[PDB]
Design a protein around this ligand. Structure first.
Ligand SMILES: Cc1ccc(-c2cc(C(=O)O)c3c(c2)ncn3CCCNS(C)(=O)=O)c(Cl)c1
Ligand SMILES: [Zn+2]
Length: 354
C-alpha cells in the first residue's frame, strides 16, 4: 500500500492541468450551448450535471472529457428493441400538440440517427467561428481543442418517467446506501442517448440507449454507509482512492499496449462499473478503512479479473446487459487483458513502478 499511496500522491500533481483544461472545455461548451438554443428543435437544451469534481465536465482519461446535453422531452413512450434491455425505440403518448422534435419522426418513432445528424450539423458550423477546435470521427460528437484536449458531447433526451422494467433489479445499493436512497435515486429522471445497437455487422440506427451517467456523482460523493463518511477525521475510507487507482491502472495498461492497440475497447466505464459492484459486495465502511488501501485495491482488481475471465460485467443499472458480451468486446481482447491484469496483480503492480 506504500506503493499505492505514492501513486495517488503523484496524481494530485496534475490537478492544475486538469482544472485549466476543464475550464477550456467549459468555454467551448457554453458557446455551443448558445447556438443549439436558437434552433426550434434544441431550445430546451442545457448542460447535464454529471461530474464528480467539475460540475458540467466529467474526466474520462488524462486529456479526454465527457459532457452531456440534456433535452427535456415530455410524454415519452418506450418500446424495447428485441430483448437488448438497454436499447429502446422512442415514441410519444399522443399528439397533445405537435411537438418541436416532430421533424425527426418516422411514423410513430423518433429517429436517433436523424436527430443526431442535425445535432452534429449545428455543432460543426459553430466550430469554425479563438481556440482551435475541430471534429473527430465515429453515440457522441467529439472535439479536439488546441490539438491536445478531447471532448465528447452526448445529446440525451430527459425523461422524468418511472425507470423501465429492465432496471427493476439494478442499482443494488440496498445493503450499502439503504433502500430509501435507492428509492430517492429511482425517482430522478433517466436519459436516452442515440447509441445504436449492433445487429449483424451493421447498426440499427433508430434505437436509443438508456443512460444513468448522472447518478455517479450522486453516489461517488455520498458513498458510505455512514452519512458522514469522509466528512470528519474519524471516518476516512479509501473508496474514492480505489476508484482512482482502478482507472489509473487501465490508463497505464492502455498506454503500454498502444502498439497493437489490444485494449482499444476498454474504458473507465467498465472500471467504474466493477468498482461499484465491489461496493455492493462490501457494504460496510469498515471494509474500506484507509489503512487497508492495499487489500481494498486487491479486492477491486480481483473482481475486475473475475469479470474478464468469465467475460461477464453487468451494467450496474441493467443486470441483463453484459458490458463484456461478445457482441460488444471480442473474445481475444478480453482474454488478453485478463492475462495482463493477472500478471499485474500477481507481481504487485510493477506498472506502478518508478
Ligand atoms: C453507481 C453508478 C452510477 C453511474 C454509473 C455510470 C453510468 C453510465 C451510464 O449508464 O450512462 C456511464 C458512466 C457511469 N460513465 C459513463 N457512462 C456512459 C455510458 C457508457 N455507454 S456509452 C459511452 O453511452 O456508449 C455507474 Cl457505472 C455506477
Ligand atoms: Zn468515505
Amino acid at each position: 500500500a506504500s506503493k499505492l499511496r505514492a501513486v495517488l500522491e503523484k496524481l494530485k500533481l496534475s490537478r492544475d492541468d486538469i482544472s485549466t483544461a476543464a475550464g477550456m472545455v467549459k468555454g467551448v461548451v457554453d458557446h455551443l450551448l448558445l447556438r443549439l438554443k436558437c434552433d426550434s428543435a434544441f431550445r430546451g437544451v442545457g448542460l447535464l450535471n454529471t461530474g464528480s469534481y467539475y460540475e458540467h465536465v466529467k474526466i474520462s482519461a488524462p486529456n479526454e472529457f465527457d459532457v452531456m446535453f440534456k433535452l427535456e422531452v415530455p410524454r415519452i413512450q418506450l418500446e424495447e428493441y428485441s430483448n437488448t434491455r438497454a436499447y429502446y425505440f422512442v415514441k410519444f403518448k399522443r399528439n397533445p400538440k405537435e411537438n418541436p422534435l416532430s421533424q425527426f419522426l418516422e411514423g410513430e418513432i423518433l429517429s436517433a440517427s436523424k436527430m443526431l445528424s442535425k445535432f452534429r450539423k449545428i455543432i460543426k458550423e459553430e466550430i469554425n467561428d479563438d481556440t482551435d477546435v475541430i471534429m473527430k470521427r465515429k453515440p457522441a460528437v467529439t472535439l479536439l481543442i488546441s490539438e491536445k484536449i478531447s471532448v465528447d458531447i452526448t445529446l440525451a433526451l430527459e425523461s422524468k418517467s418511472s425507470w423501465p422494467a429492465s432496471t427493476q433489479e439494478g442499482l443494488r445499493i440496498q445493503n450499502w446506501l439503504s433502500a430509501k436512497v435507492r428509492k430517492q435515486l429511482r425517482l430522478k429522471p433517466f436519459y436516452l442517448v442515440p447509441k445504436h445497437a449492433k445487429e449483424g455487422n451493421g447498426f440499427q440506427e433508430e434505437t436509443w440507449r438508456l443512460s444513468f451517467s448522472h447518478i455517479e456523482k450522486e453516489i461517488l460523493n455520498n458513498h458510505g454507509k455512514s452519512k458522514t463518511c469522509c466528512e470528519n477525521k474519524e471516518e476516512k475510507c479509501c473508496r474514492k482512492d480505489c476508484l482512482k487507482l482502478m482507472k489509473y491502472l487501465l490508463e497505464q495498461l492502455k498506454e503500454r499496449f498502444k502498439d497493437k492497440k489490444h485494449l482499444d475497447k476498454f474504458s473507465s466505464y467498465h472500471v467504474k462499473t466493477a468498482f461499484f459492484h465491489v461496493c455492493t459486495q462490501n457494504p460496510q465502511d469498515s471494509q474500506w478503512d484507509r489503512k487497508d488501501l492495499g487489500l481494498c485495491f486487491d479486492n477491486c482488481v480481483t473482481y475486475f479479473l473475475q469479470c474478464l475471465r468469465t467475460e461477464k460485467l453487468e451494467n450496474y443499472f441493467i443486470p441483463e446487459f453484459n458490458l463484456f458480451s461478445s457482441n460488444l468486446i471480442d473474445k481475444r481482447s478480453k482474454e488478453f487483458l485478463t492475462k495482463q491484469i493477472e500478471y499485474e496483480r500477481n507481481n504487485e503492480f510493477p506498472v506502478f513502478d518508478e
